[PDB]
């Protein structure tokens, strides 16, 4: 298989450091130029850095120069990013990506990783509060997942056995600096007396798992 796998992302305070790794396998890593590209939540792609196969040529984005160092280890098929004196606006999903360029001027990033998320904030990690959105044909019920930092939170219903009719909404950043989302599912009204509904909320950054049974 052709794979790129990044890691090292985390939550750090402004001015602190992080080192990202991008492990490649399944293609000739030493033949290709490598890139770091980042993406802020809800935003477009922004190029960070590039390194040629032989490490002899390097490029950096303007906001990044003097703070970030790209490097690679061809024998380990790995690409790195040392990120120094980090700022709030460096918060993003960070991708590594392989170029198709090979002794020519054909440019294209054809293989990408899944990304590692970097959060730069003074704000401490905080687990959610989980409140029911109780059911009032078809009924609706849900869970309000309130006041957590940082993203993400994941929600499932009935330990994964309920998926149809589920809508877990994109989080919203409240004026408090804390996130909030709702997760809902519509159900036949007839089943409300007979069927049990539990939302399983998980917030990894705070080690929070909450199961909320949602009832009339």
């Amino acid at each position: 298989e052709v794979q790129l796998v990044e890691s090292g992302g985390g939550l750090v305070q402004p001015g602190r450091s992080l080192r990202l790794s991008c492990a490649a396998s399944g293609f000739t890593f030493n033949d290709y130029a490598m890139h770091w590209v980042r993406q802020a939540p809800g935003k477009g792609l922004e190029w960070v850095s590039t390194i040629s196969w032989n490490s002899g040529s390097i490029g950096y984005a303007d906001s990044v120069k003097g703070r970030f160092t790209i490097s690679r280890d061809n024998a380990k098929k790995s690409l790195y990013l040392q990120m120094n004196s980090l700022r709030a606006e460096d918060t993003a999903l960070y991708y590594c990506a392989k170029d198709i360029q090979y002794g020519n001027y054909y440019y294209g990033m054809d293989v990408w990783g899944q990304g590692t998320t970097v959060t730069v904030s003074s704000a401490s990690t905080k687990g959610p509060s989980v409140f029911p959105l109780a059911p009032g044909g078809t009924a609706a019920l849900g869970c309000l997942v309130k006041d957590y930092f940082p993203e993400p939170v994941t929600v499932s219903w009935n330990s994964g056995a309920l998926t149809s009719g589920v809508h877990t909404f994109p989080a919203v950043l409240q004026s408090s600096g804390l996130y909030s989302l709702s997760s809902v599912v519509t159900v036949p009204s007839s089943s409300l007396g007979t069927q049990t509904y539990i939302c399983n909320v998980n917030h990894k950054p705070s080690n929070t798992k909450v199961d909320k049974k949602v009832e009339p």
């Binding site: 190029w47 950096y60 294209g108």
Partner: protein, 211 residues
Amino acid sequence: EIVLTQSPATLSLSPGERATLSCRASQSVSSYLAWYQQKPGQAPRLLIYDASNRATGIPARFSGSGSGTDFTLTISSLEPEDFAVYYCQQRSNWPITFGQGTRLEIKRTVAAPSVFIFPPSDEQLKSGTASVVCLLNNFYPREAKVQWKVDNALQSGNSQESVTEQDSKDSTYSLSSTLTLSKADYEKHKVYACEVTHQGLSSPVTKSFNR
């Protein structure tokens, strides 16, 4: 840097129709223009490189054209898997820059939402905050007006909304609107109402509860 402007920002089309996406550069990039597709939750996917060369395995319905400053991605007969965000990228000039994207959305027949209102829970009220939630379920188009009324007075500035990605089964949207008050303020009022205005609704639908 070279700035790339993409238009339109959003495009609504039905499967089978032709999509025409524009990328314009602030200065010449020659042929060094690539196109990417990106779905929600997923990494970008290379479609076109050198303005007009399809990347390996990309269906023939994708074609790129242009030179200098003006470029076009054409999808000649849209498929359901083609509905995604599309970015252009130039490789002429340091730094590497991207357009801000064109979101390509499925045009569908009009569907009216079903509407639900939820009062705050008793568990939340003890903490001194009241979240009132309004749900619109499975509607098309994305455009909806959802207003809150408290004791029949239209509210302003005190709610936020959030919309799902287009549904992979029925091409509809779902939306949440959340009204936030202090417990104190919340307990001063009698009736809480969500009024929803949508193309699929002949007149506005209202859902309410009495605190």
